[PDB]
Amino acid sequence: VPGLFEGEEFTALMHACKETAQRNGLILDSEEELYKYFTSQVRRNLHV
């Protein structure tokens, strides 16, 4: 959701992203590479 996460939110989100990435054995630094990871994770965990 474009904009849903921005500013203050985007901070915790990004960190929690690389925190999860390291676990799954995936090294992600750039915020753009991290977002793709976050987006994909939701695509296969939400189910509306």
From Swiss-Prot:
Function of the molecule: Cytoplasmic dynein acts as a motor for the intracellular retrograde motility of vesicles and organelles along microtubules. Dynein has ATPase activity; the force-producing power stroke is thought to occur on release of ADP.
Domains: entry comment: Dynein heavy chains probably consist of an N-terminal stem (which binds cargo and interacts with other dynein components), and the head or motor domain. The motor contains six tandemly-linked AAA domains in the head, which form a ring. A stalk-like structure (formed by two of the coiled coil domains) protrudes between AAA 4 and AAA 5 and terminates in a microtubule-binding site. A seventh domain may also contribute to this ring; it is not clear whether the N-terminus or the C-terminus forms this extra domain.
Superkingdom of the source species: Eukaryota
Family per similarity comment: Belongs to the dynein heavy chain family.
Designated name of the protein: Dynein heavy chain, cytoplasmic
Membrane-spanning segments: none
Source species: Dictyostelium discoideum (Social amoeba)
Disulfide pairings: none
Subunit structure: Consists of at least two heavy chains and a number of intermediate and light chains.
Cellular localisation: Cytoplasm, Cytoskeleton
